[PDB]
Amino acid sequence: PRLKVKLVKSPIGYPKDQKAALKALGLRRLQQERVLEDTPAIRGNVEKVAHLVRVEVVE
Amino acid sequence: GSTRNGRDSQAKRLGVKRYEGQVVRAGNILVRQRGTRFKPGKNVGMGRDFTLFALVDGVVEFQDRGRLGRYVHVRPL
RNA sequence: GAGGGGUUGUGGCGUGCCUAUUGAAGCAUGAGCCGGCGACUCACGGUCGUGGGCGAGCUUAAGCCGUUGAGGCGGAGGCGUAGGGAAACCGAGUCCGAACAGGGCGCAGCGGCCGCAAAGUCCGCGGCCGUGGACCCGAAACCGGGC
RNA sequence: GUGGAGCCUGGGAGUGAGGGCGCGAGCGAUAACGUCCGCGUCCGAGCGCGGGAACAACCGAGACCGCCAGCUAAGGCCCCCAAGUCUGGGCUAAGUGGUAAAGGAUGUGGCGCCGCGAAGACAGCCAGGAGGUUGGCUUAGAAGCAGCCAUCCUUUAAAGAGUGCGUAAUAGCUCACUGGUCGAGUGGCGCCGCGCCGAAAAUGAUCGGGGCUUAAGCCCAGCGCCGAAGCUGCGGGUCUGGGGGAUGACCCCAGGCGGUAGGGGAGCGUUCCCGAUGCCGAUGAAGGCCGACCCGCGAGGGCGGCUGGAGGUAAGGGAAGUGC
RNA sequence: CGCCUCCUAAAAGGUAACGGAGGCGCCCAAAGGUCCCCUCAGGCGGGACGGAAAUCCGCCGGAGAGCGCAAGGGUAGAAGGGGGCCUGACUGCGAGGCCUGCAAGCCGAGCAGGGGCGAAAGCCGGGCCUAGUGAACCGGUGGUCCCGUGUGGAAGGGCCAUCGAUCAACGGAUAAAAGUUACCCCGGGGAUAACAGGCUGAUCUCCCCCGAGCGUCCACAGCGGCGGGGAGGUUUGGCACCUCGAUGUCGGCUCGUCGCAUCCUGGGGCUGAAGAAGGUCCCAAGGGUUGGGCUGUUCGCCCAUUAAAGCGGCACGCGAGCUG
RNA sequence: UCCCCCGUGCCCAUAGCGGCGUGGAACCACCCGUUCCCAUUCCGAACACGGAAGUGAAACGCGCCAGCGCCGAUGGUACUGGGCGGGCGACCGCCUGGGAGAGUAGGUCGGUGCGGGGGA
């Protein structure tokens, strides 16, 4: 069970800890997609930036 | 036109210094305080200015004993 | 001479340069234009870094001899090889102390004898620091001797 | 959680005038493009790009280079102006939209809530509306209706010693009030949406303009498209990492590459020295003037034609009066 | 102007303003160490002199008293009150920490020496705690006997301990220090005032809402208590945003031009409008809006007239147009 | 291992105040004395010693009672981390996660560890 996370809204203008969450997820470019294992710690950062991101449950 | 106020003293950096579960060494300060807001418990001494400090290496534990007060203990490792 | 050069009618877009500023196209500074001159260096010391030499050692200074764009000699001396203490002094310790206490400051190679790699030190190079005007230009002034 | 993350030692700094905005406070006047802190953010240094008419900091978005390719963001799709004169339901008539408040109003629409009414309402027309009472605090008037410490009867279908107008008083009109007349609604509340007034300032006006009314305005619900230097496709550069391969030989894959103060790296060119008793040079040195050519990311370097007429100087190193 | 307490301070710490409130520059030989004992303020009732409150008794009374002094925290299961013995208001040190730019400041178990109290467990390196303070340099005093300029001494130093700071501008320039400049000068700043502009609109000017009450009667002809909402940007200011490598200032003269909250003339409604003359409001910016005395004046007062002798904006319009 | 009592802890008022009732064999207390140890800023009240005639009156223990005190949901709301909108403002909303305080229903006249003496 995994999470497909697409960065869809720019973090410019958002607090630095939300920029850091993106770094924890490996999201560094707009429209970039990452597939991460679905653990509570990863899901914590995905939710932190949910207003920036598009999520999809996979495999 | 002039102010009779304008004075204040330096802040004193009071408060708890080691929270429950933290590993301390003997002599470590655990609480800076005015009076006995916390009381020394097992393996914790108290100095002339109410400072709580650990008497042994170990782990900090807090305990709220109601009307008996709040206590800081150090459980040896 | 299926390409390119010159010119520019129309359409799109478009707030000089530098300086100083929170912020300048800015109605803030400087510049008419062109050419030439024009501002981070050098000596000595220091501190790191670095390229080499040698290594419990490293290195010479003034000179002297040679050379006439030839190098050599010269160990006086300097840094390092021990620290601690105000000092007497003791010394891998020493200082405080009554202490054999406690504490401060100190004390310590890889390989199959030879290698290597290294204290440290010498020289070159580079950054930055100290002393000099020390990146360059600029006062109002102060002082001396004359007119 | 492998990130231009973190920690340790040391070399070099610059900065120590901030500013807007959002939130939380203090000061100020629940003033200031005001001021002083806190958390955040952007500009500073992103006055690079789209939107906002124009505009550092509002919205969108972090610009390595190239393309007459594609998708989007905010914002837009009647014409200026790229894309809908797109679809369905409603509202507004004020050009409201396209700057303002207490407050005022039979503007409009949607709701609730009372009543009063075919035991005949409301409106209109039609009568009546009356004795005690020129009444009591009362006199200088106070006679229902100048203020009070009053509302009581009587004749009735009905009638408050009185709603408003009038008198100095009186009267008078006329209300609540009851009867007839027609023949179905009528009066009063409260709430919501959108509008109206309240709304005067100095050069010429204007929502950015034109112009727009079952909108090209506003509210609700949709489908499509346009739209940036964001994202994608293709090609290239450089650095970093990983592979090749063993080592800078070149290749392949991946990622980073806005930037002021400032740190670091790699280069270009100028003058001079070694190279050089050499070598290029009158079949033409240096310098000058051209070039649409070649190499180089670039600073530059070649090459060619003309000028010029005697100097110039390689690979590799060295030193500075070195680039306006 | 250093230091302490509380708040501001956005529930860790820290956090500013010429923000809101208070305190310190001491003190105590016990007000210190230890051992033992004791428990408040206040209310009610009772008691000679004796009272709101002196001292006594009883009942209720968890902490509102007390703790030398500000404030806060803490506190009777004592840190409060009383007594006995005492000097730990130790010497030599100090694991480990708090805080922190530095330097300071703070807490501190434990070991040794020699003690105090206690039967003992133990406690004691001043004070319930947080303010009661001052780095160096220079010098004094006691001790130490470490240095002693050929040598022995001595002079003079070092070391240990302690002293002399309103160095209070309290991280403290010298051992030693006030004014004036319109006779002024230089370097700078629109980092910062005076002018004008800007933002703001408290103040200013104007317009409204409410309807007490006035107006013989009658809230609204004309007025409008106490309160409430706005507009304008001509006043005085707030702020300090362009301009200090210069944006010339009051008043006058000259020349206009604009706004309309209209002074006159034109058109109106209401009137407590008989007429005539007025008052008040509405529409209206086309034109017009005098001459003189005083004063630098703007303004204003005055004289004589007038249909009227309007008020504001234009860098308080206009000095590369004049005056001064 | 059950009930009563006596010591001593823990939870820290659901354990408290008040009213009533109960217990003396045992234990505890008051009690009986003040010679002795010790003691009163006076007092054998207290502290202390030696006792054992009495009483559970005081105190203590154990019950019952909800007048006070104490505890107190569920539901709803305020507020809010994060995300969004609106207003010229004072300020007002929406989404997601969190979520009081007051008050209401109700609860409570304690629960429990260890040792000792007694009882069955």
Ligand SMILES: CC(=O)[C@H]1O[C@@H](OC2=CCC(/C=C(\C)C(=O)N[C@@H]3[C@H](O)[C@@H](O)[C@H]4OCO[C@H]4[C@@H]3O)=CC2=O)[C@@H](O)[C@@H]1O
């Ligand atoms: C002039 C200069 O050289 C420079 O200064 C700048 O200009 C000005 C500076 C100051 C100024 C006015 C001042 C100081 C004043 O106090 N003015 C008041 C009052 O406000 C004024 O209206 C008059 O009122 C009656 O008397 C006056 C009264 O003293 C006017 C200026 O124009 C700059 O642009 C110029 O280059």
Ligand SMILES: NC(=[NH2+])NCCC[C@H](N)C(=O)O
């Ligand atoms: N989920 C929250 N933290 N909400 C905060 C509420 C604040 C916001 N101004 C509102 O009234 O809606």
Ligand SMILES: [Mg+2]
């Ligand atoms: Mg998406």
Ligand SMILES: [Mg+2]
């Ligand atoms: Mg964004």
Ligand SMILES: [Mg+2]
């Ligand atoms: Mg981004």
Ligand SMILES: [Mg+2]
């Ligand atoms: Mg944004």
Ligand SMILES: [Mg+2]
């Ligand atoms: Mg955040």
Ligand SMILES: [Mg+2]
């Ligand atoms: Mg955080």
Ligand SMILES: [Mg+2]
């Ligand atoms: Mg991106």
Ligand SMILES: [Mg+2]
């Ligand atoms: Mg004062």
Ligand SMILES: [Mg+2]
């Ligand atoms: Mg203050």
Ligand SMILES: [Mg+2]
């Ligand atoms: Mg002060």
Ligand SMILES: [Mg+2]
């Ligand atoms: Mg402080």
Ligand SMILES: [Mg+2]
């Ligand atoms: Mg402070």
Ligand SMILES: [Mg+2]
């Ligand atoms: Mg403080």
Ligand SMILES: [Mg+2]
């Ligand atoms: Mg704390």
